[PDB]
Design a protein around this ligand. Structure first.
Ligand SMILES: [Zn+2]
Ligand SMILES: [Zn+2]
Ligand SMILES: [Zn+2]
Length: 178
């Protein structure tokens, strides 16, 4: 197994996957690494199994159909993975914890949003459909763009949103288009 966490790329107290060489800090993995369970399979392994059990799940989908899906176990897992993929980028640090807004010439967003809040929401089963999760994720970056206006710091929102959107299209097998 790897000697660094797959998400944050640091060493420390790591839990190793039994079916692939990835390792995780307890609260870097999503969901948090489970108490017992030997063997234990990580979220990358669990997602791969879904695809392997239903190869047709990789055919193209319309985003509008994906968003209306109810958050049954497999969609819940897919959203957890997609959130994890965003935390894997080091630029996620900017969006992880609760933000605050005091900048000359800007007003804060009406509905602040951040990754740790989406993480809690997922953990507490607060989303009933994929759309709930996706809307909160996209709101993070939209609030950032709106607040930072012409500051070049706006680009961090663009960059992390691109990571999100690529991974959304991959995980939920959205039909490729130009
Ligand atoms: Zn970690
Ligand atoms: Zn694994
Ligand atoms: Zn089948």
């Amino acid at each position: 197994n790897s000697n660094i966490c797959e998400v944050c790329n640091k060493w420390g107290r790591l839990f190793c996957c039994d079916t692939c060489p990835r390792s995780f800090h307890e609260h870097c993995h999503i969901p948090s690494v489970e108490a017992n369970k030997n063997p234990w399979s990580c979220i990358f392994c669990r997602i791969k199994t879904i695809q392997e059990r239903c190869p047709e799940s990789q055919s193209g989908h319309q985003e509008s159909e994906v968003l209306m899906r109810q958050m049954l176990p497999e969609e819940q897992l897919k959203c957890e993975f997609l959130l994890l993929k965003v935390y894997c980028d080091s630029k996620s640090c900017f969006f992880a914890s609760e933000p605050y807004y005091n900048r000359e010439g800007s007003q804060g967003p009406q509905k602040p949003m951040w990754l740790n809040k989406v993480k809690t929401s997922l953990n507490e089963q607060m989303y009933t459909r994929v759309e709930g999760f996706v809307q909160d994720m996209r709101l993070i970056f939209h609030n950032h763009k709106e607040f930072y206006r012409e500051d070049k710091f706006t680009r961090l929102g663009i960059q992390v949103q691109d990571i999100f959107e690529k991974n959304f299209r991959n995980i939920f097998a959205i039909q490729e288009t130009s």
